């Protein structure tokens, strides 16, 4: 299978630490957005939305990195714990995945991409959102090992790719002591995480500290 | 199963959707939200980010609606159309829930909310994200009857309650032909249409009224 992707963003780096937990090759493909690349016809064939990630496989083209996570464990993922078939199980992975693309990503993202693309300053009411959201993902962490359970899951690997993020922006996440311990968890059992997920965070470290 | 709720929210009536098409009882229990009954530290136990919907299933609190209705068919609705088994055909019915949270309601949510609890003029920016998720949505139903194949899948119902509410913000979304084509097939063909979304949609087009 194919994956169209860029090292800095935090959903590619989400696929990458999923494939590397599955023991699953992909066909990296870095995307031009230097040039443009996304918005040619050939990529929007495969991504209307001309977004990373883009999975193929055999034909078939996935956008949304959460989609991808589930859809590489539904698929390629036998013996793993990573997506548990059980459906309370999963409902704890699948809220978490919720949890993190639409409320603690989408806060980071409108709290620092004005300050990085628009040279805005920074606006504390979206900083105590992001607190906020930290702080909902410090009780879901209080007395378990991972976000979903005692296994590792593609949840925690989509929010330590968002989490990870955050030191980029100086955001205080540490401070947190249950999100702390999960933080460090993660990094030390998730497979190949300084492969699939340090690597591309240090590119968007030096595009950030090239700007700020 | 109970399910604390609210009529004028979207992801409360995607969930009563999916319960019509499941043909499932769920306990209904309305969230008072004039008292702040959200923040009671009870509510709180079985949800930290005080929110609608939760539904409670022995034992278990499932937060986010996208979550709460892939649970109810993978819990009781097995072998059913609306959520299918297939990877491939899970991973776009995935796809077309996480677009829904984060590109489609995400972008409404930022055009129409500033207006109406914030106060301030129109966003035509804004409304530019809003009209290109409509065209990102359109070109997913360029060639199927729904939004992830030729069946009803919770991702129509996800995205019918989504749309519904951009009644209420006078936003035109049938100029989009395969969105109009689309959106009237699922208020023919998903059960309980009415009852579950269209009853609801009517608080929120109360409160635009009154205020705009």
Redesign the interface.
């Given at each position: 299978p194919d994956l169209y992707y860029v090292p800095g963003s935090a959903p590619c780096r989400a696929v990458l630490l999923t494939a590397k937990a599955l023991n699953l090759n992909l066909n990296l493909k870095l995307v031009d957005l230097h040039h443009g690349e996304q918005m040619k016809p050939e990529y929007l064939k495969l991504n209307?939305?001309h977004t990373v990630p883009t999975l193929v496989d055999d034909g078939?083209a996935?956008?949304?990195s959460?989609?991808?996570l589930?859809?590489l464990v539904?698929?390629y993922g036998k013996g793993s714990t990573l997506y548990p078939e059980d459906?309370?199980a999963?409902?704890?992975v699948?809220?978490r995945?919720?949890?993190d693309?639409?409320?603690l990503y989408?806060r980071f993202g409108d709290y620092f991409y004005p300050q990085l693309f628009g040279g805005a300053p920074e606006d504390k009411e979206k900083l105590a959102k992001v607190d906020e959201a930290l702080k909902?993902l410090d009780?879901?962490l209080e007395g378990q090992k991972y976000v979903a359970g005692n296994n590792l899951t593609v949840a925690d690997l989509s929010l330590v790719a968002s989490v990870s993020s955050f030191e980029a922006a100086n955001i205080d996440f540490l401070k947190y002591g249950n999100v702390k311990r999960w933080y460090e968890t993660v990094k030390a059992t998730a497979p190949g995480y300084e492969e699939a997920n340090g690597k591309g965070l240090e590119a968007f470290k030096g595009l950030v500290n090239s700007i700020m």
């Open positions: 209307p939305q078939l996935i956008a949304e959460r989609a991808i589930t859809y539904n698929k459906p309370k999963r409902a704890i699948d809220q995945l919720y949890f693309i639409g409320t989408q909902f009780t879901f």
